[PDB]
Design an enzyme around this catalytic site. Structure first.
Site, PDB file in Angstrom:
ATOM      1  N   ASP A 234       0.913  -1.200   0.125  1.00  0.00           N
ATOM      2  CA  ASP A 234       0.032  -0.227  -0.123  1.00  0.00           C
ATOM      3  C   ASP A 234       0.802   1.337  -0.016  1.00  0.00           C
ATOM      4  OD1 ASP A 234      -2.295  -1.581   0.089  1.00  0.00           O
ATOM      5  OD2 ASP A 234      -2.632  -1.419   2.351  1.00  0.00           O
TER       6      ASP A 234
ATOM      7  N   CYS B 166      -2.003   2.289 -13.018  1.00  0.00           N
ATOM      8  CA  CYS B 166      -2.120   2.147 -11.359  1.00  0.00           C
ATOM      9  C   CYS B 166      -3.216   3.029 -10.976  1.00  0.00           C
ATOM     10  CB  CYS B 166      -0.692   2.627 -10.639  1.00  0.00           C
ATOM     11  SG  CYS B 166       0.143   3.958 -10.978  1.00  0.00           S
ATOM     12  N   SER B 167      -3.302   3.975 -10.066  1.00  0.00           N
ATOM     13  CA  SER B 167      -4.144   4.863  -9.923  1.00  0.00           C
ATOM     14  C   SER B 167      -4.414   6.397 -10.542  1.00  0.00           C
ATOM     15  CB  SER B 167      -4.186   5.213  -8.250  1.00  0.00           C
ATOM     16  OG  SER B 167      -2.826   5.620  -7.749  1.00  0.00           O
ATOM     17  N   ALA B 168      -2.964   7.028 -10.419  1.00  0.00           N
ATOM     18  CA  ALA B 168      -2.724   8.318 -11.139  1.00  0.00           C
ATOM     19  C   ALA B 168      -1.983   7.945 -12.442  1.00  0.00           C
ATOM     20  CB  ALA B 168      -2.180   9.415 -10.435  1.00  0.00           C
ATOM     21  N   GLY B 169      -1.419   6.788 -12.468  1.00  0.00           N
ATOM     22  CA  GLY B 169      -0.468   6.268 -13.640  1.00  0.00           C
ATOM     23  C   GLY B 169       0.713   6.916 -13.822  1.00  0.00           C
ATOM     24  N   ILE B 170       1.196   7.433 -12.514  1.00  0.00           N
ATOM     25  CA  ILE B 170       2.819   7.974 -12.771  1.00  0.00           C
ATOM     26  C   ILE B 170       3.610   7.195 -11.778  1.00  0.00           C
ATOM     27  CG2 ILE B 170       2.004  10.161 -13.583  1.00  0.00           C
ATOM     28  CD1 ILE B 170       2.053  11.239 -10.761  1.00  0.00           C
ATOM     29  N   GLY B 171       3.352   7.069 -10.642  1.00  0.00           N
ATOM     30  CA  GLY B 171       4.290   6.352  -9.986  1.00  0.00           C
ATOM     31  C   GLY B 171       4.706   4.769 -10.161  1.00  0.00           C
ATOM     32  N   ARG B 172       3.604   3.968  -9.713  1.00  0.00           N
ATOM     33  CA  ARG B 172       3.984   2.663 -10.056  1.00  0.00           C
ATOM     34  C   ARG B 172       3.976   2.133 -11.308  1.00  0.00           C
ATOM     35  NH1 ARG B 172      -0.474  -0.220  -5.910  1.00  0.00           N
ATOM     36  NH2 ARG B 172      -0.079   1.081  -3.894  1.00  0.00           N
TER      37      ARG B 172
ATOM     38  N   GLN C  56       8.016   8.230  -9.230  1.00  0.00           N
ATOM     39  CA  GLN C  56       7.436   9.033  -8.071  1.00  0.00           C
ATOM     40  C   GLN C  56       8.450   9.426  -6.955  1.00  0.00           C
ATOM     41  OE1 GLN C  56       4.640  11.614  -7.499  1.00  0.00           O
ATOM     42  NE2 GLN C  56       5.224  11.387  -9.509  1.00  0.00           N
TER      43      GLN C  56
END
Ligand SMILES: CN(C)Cc1ccc(-c2cc3onc(-c4ccccc4Cl)c3c(=O)n2C)cc1
Length: 468
Positions: free
Chosen positions: A368, A402-408, A449
């Protein structure tokens, strides 16, 4: 990006803002390591605002979520008031600063890894500017530090080495025999041979080196403030999961309702995107169809920490569903340790002959917060994804979200780009992790990120090469 001070305490920030700033003066600094603080001056008093990033976005207290610190600052300077950046004179996060470095070692680096215009700046109390010119020679220019000002022995006295370097980058020093001491590009030292990743990982694991390198890469994000107008349009606001996490216009996926918070990533290509909203499921399937994508990589759970990260955009196993003019059958679900594979068939309603299989690889065990403790699972997953993609004749870009599509998303794409170089060229190839990140970051804001993810990319690459 001079408003970012990499080595200062809160007390140092307060003294900086109170004695050298005015009301509206601000600075950003690293704080709980992994977090940031926005120190702002308002009515003769200094306010400290916490910025948190666990790997998905920069979450500013009292504010919004952003892709970069330069994007956060730009937004608040264009919309507590941030009026005046308080500039950092410390050269630590500059690409050309090498701190302690010998004249022989610096000449060795410039002779082997350098070209015409390659320069560096190194360190009693004075600094040296070493430059390469020709096709060839290496020249050393002394930089005296007198009363906290820098000079080359005459003319201007600069407040920082950055101010001295930028001035001589625009107006180059000419040797009194014709040679122009051109400061074209900083010396590239980040590029390693693939076979020596273990030596570099060990060097970067020393007091930490990974933090020093990630932060130098972060100082180059100011060059990536490309327009995101289409995502700011009234009609497109609720098509974004996070209001200010937007796709660059020059790389955005155009749908032939032409908008999706997605970007093409060109190193095999990728589409880096956010987790679906209920109102964007139809736009997502239109994207997959138009781009002839055959593989989707999902790196988030639907729900994390009680918050929704991506809506369920695929049908239940054996079910058939219509998403606007798109139609999806979930043929079969296969479960492995770290992930689930879903065999989906996509077609356009009214047109049977448009059918194609779309393989959805859903990684379900990513922590998480932070990164996995071992990269083995992610690598096995990326290996299986690569093979599926390679097996399909004329498959479109791999969809990654992923969620915002930048990190993972940015982490997965970067590991995948790097591993691919080692697949085609072999253990005898050049790899350059920050150059690669910077390249992917110019195609979608804030791809990769955190420093944890950055370190994870090196570890993933280390593991792939070891298990060879
Ligand atoms: C250990 N210290 C004392 C010496 C030292 C070591 C490495 C660097 C160095 C770090 C970088 O982190 N990102 C980039 C980058 C940004 C934009 C594009 C490409 C790239 Cl590669 C980068 C870079 O270029 N250099 C040279 C700077 C100083």
């Amino acid at each position: 990006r001079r408003w970012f001070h990499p080595n200062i305490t809160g007390v140092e920030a307060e003294n900086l803002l109170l004695t050298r700033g005015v009301d509206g003066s601000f600075l950003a600094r690293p704080s709980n390591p992994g977090d940031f603080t926005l120190s702002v001056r308002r009515n003769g008093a200094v306010t400290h605002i916490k910025i948190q990033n666990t790997g998905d976005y920069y979450d500013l207290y009292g504010g919004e979520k952003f892709a970069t610190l330069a994007e956060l600052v730009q937004y608040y300077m264009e919309h507590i008031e941030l009026k005046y950046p308080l500039n950092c004179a410390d050269p630590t996060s500059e690409r050309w600063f090498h701190g302690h470095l010998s004249g022989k070692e610096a000449e060795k680096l410039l002779t082997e890894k350098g070209k015409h215009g390659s320069f560096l700046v190194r360190e009693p109390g004075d600094f040296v500017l070493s430059v390469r010119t020709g096709d060839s020679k290496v020249t050393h220019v002394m930089i005296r530090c007198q009363e906290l000002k820098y000079d080359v022995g005459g003319g201007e006295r600069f407040d920082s080495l950055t101010d001295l370097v930028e001035h001589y980058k625009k107006n180059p020093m000419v040797e009194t025999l014709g040679t122009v001491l051109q400061l074209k590009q900083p010396l590239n030292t980040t590029r390693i041979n693939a076979a020596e990743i273990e030596s570099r990982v060990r060097e970067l694991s020393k007091l930490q080196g990974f933090w020093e390198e990630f932060e130098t890469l972060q100082q180059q994000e100011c060059k990536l403030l490309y327009s995101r107008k289409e995502g700011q349009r009234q009609e497109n606001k609720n098509k974004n999961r996070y209001k200010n996490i937007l796709p660059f216009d020059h790389t955005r996926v155009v749908l032939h309702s032409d908008y999706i918070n997605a970007n093409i990533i060109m190193p095999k290509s990728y589409i880096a995107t956010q987790g679906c909203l209920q109102n964007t499921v139809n736009d997502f399937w239109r994207m997959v169809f138009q781009e002839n994508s055959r593989v989707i990589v999902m790196t988030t759970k639907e729900v994390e920490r009680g918050k929704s990260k991506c809506v369920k955009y695929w049908p239940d196993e054996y079910a058939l569903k219509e998403y606007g003019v798109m139609r999806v059958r979930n043929v079969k679900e296969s479960a492995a340790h770290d992930y689930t594979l879903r065999e989906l068939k996509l077609s356009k309603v009214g047109q049977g002959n448009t059918e194609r299989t779309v393989w959805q690889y859903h990684f379900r065990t990513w922590p998480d917060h932070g990164v996995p403790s071992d990269p083995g699972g992610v690598l096995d997953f990326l290996e299986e994804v690569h093979h599926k993609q390679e097996s399909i004749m004329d498959a479109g870009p791999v969809v990654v979200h992923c969620s915002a599509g930048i990190g993972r998303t940015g982490t997965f794409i970067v590991i995948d780009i790097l591993i691919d170089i080692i697949r085609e060229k072999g253990v005898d190839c050049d790899i350059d992790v920050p150059k690669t990140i910077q390249m992917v970051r110019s195609q979608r804001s804030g791809m990769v990120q955190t420093e944890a993810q950055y370190r994870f990319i090196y570890m993933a690459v280390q593991h792939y090469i070891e298990t060879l």
